Structures are given as structure tokens and as C-alpha cells.
Design a protein around this ligand. Structure first.
Ligand SMILES: O=C(O)c1ccccc1O
Ligand SMILES: O=C(O)c1ccccc1O
Lengths: 99, 99
């Protein structure tokens, strides 16, 4: 596993990107564990989507993007897609655990 | 950060989720370092998009999604977007520096 500067061709590059992508999938895997646990602190299925939390989360992620060398809008939009899939998945977990 | 099981409320849940989302953002920042470095292994900009690489990457991330208990099409849908963002970022960096 080589740093960007030590990479001598695309195989080296793609070895590190595959690893990074797997970390992202693994992190998303762990995120679902916390999103499912979040369902226990929801009094109803309507209490889950929590729009104020989403709206405040998103500019928070956009800033982190900038602090990491990335244009914000795309990263904000990416997290918008992530958060909504997890919301729907939480409702699905709430429905099967609470009816 | 507590374990999913030890979280008392939404405050503990959100602490963990913020940490994982930041982990993802940082992973994306490092991924950019590698994508930018990859421009020096392309003779022309035409070589950059490399559709053959995209086609192989996709089902591999789908497979990883399943191995981590996530919807394959969803995660596969996220990467299709990520990858095309970085291709477009790569080309810009390429023109900028002329690799
Ligand atoms: O997954 C999230 O971050 C989330 C945010 C707000 C409401 C429900 C959720 O699952
Ligand atoms: O970012 C990627 O994974 C990528 C993949 C194929 C071609 C160019 C790229 O930037």
C-alpha cells in the first residue's frame, strides 16, 4: 500500500482507492447499526424522519468537506442521499420491531 | 463514542453518527489525493474516464455492500455518483497541471 506520491502506476493507485472505498462501505455498514438503535428513541414512525436534524446535519457535512479539500455541494448532496436511505431503512426497522 | 447498544438517547446516537460521517468525509478527502495522483498516469484526458475500470468497480462495491448488510443497488448507486464526480475532478486537475 503506497502513498499517492509513491505510486508508480494505476495498479498502486487502484489498490489504495479500493481499500478507501471498502472503508467507506464498512463505515456505512456500521452507520446502519446506530440508525437501527436510534429507532428505540422514537415514540412513533412520524418522529423518525426528524427534518430539523437533517437540515442541520447537511451544512455540517458541507463544512467538513471543505476542511478536507472538497467542493461542498456534491458532498452535501451525497449525504442527503445517504441520510434519506437510512431514514427509510430506520422506518422499516421500526415497523418490524414496533408494528 | 458509545456502542449502538449502550446509547441512552439521540444525543449518543448522533455523536456516533457524526464521527462515522466525518470518517467518510476524511476517507473521501484522501481518495481525492489518490485520484489527483492518478492523472500523471494518463497520456491524454481521453484516457482518464477509463470505462472499463468503472464497469469492474461497480459490481465489486455492490458485493461489498451485501457483505456489510446493505442494499447493493443503493451503495452501487452511491459509487456511480462518487466515481463520476472524481473523474470530472481528475480531468480538471489534469488540465490545470497538464499531466
Ligand atoms: O440516518 C440519519 O442520520 C438520520 C437522521 C435523521 C433522522 C433519521 C435518521 O436515520
Ligand atoms: O475515482 C475513481 O475511482 C476513478 C475510476 C476510474 C477512472 C477515473 C477515476 O477518477
Amino acid at each position: 500500500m503506497k502513498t499517492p506520491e509513491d505510486c508508480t502506476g494505476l495498479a498502486d493507485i487502484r489498490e489504495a482507492i479500493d481499500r478507501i472505498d471498502l472503508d467507506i462501505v464498512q463505515a456505512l455498514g456500521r452507520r446502519m447499526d446506530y440508525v437501527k438503535a436510534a429507532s428505540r428513541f422514537a415514540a412513533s414512525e412520524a418522529a423518525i424522519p426528524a427534518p430539523e436534524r437533517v437540515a442541520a446535519m447537511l451544512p455540517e457535512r458541507a463544512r467538513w468537506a471543505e476542511e478536507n479539500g472538497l467542493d461542498a455541494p456534491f458532498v452535501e448532496g451525497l449525504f442527503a442521499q445517504i441520510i434519506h436511505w437510512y431514514i427509510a431503512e430506520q422506518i422499516k426497522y421500526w415497523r418490524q420491531t414496533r408494528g
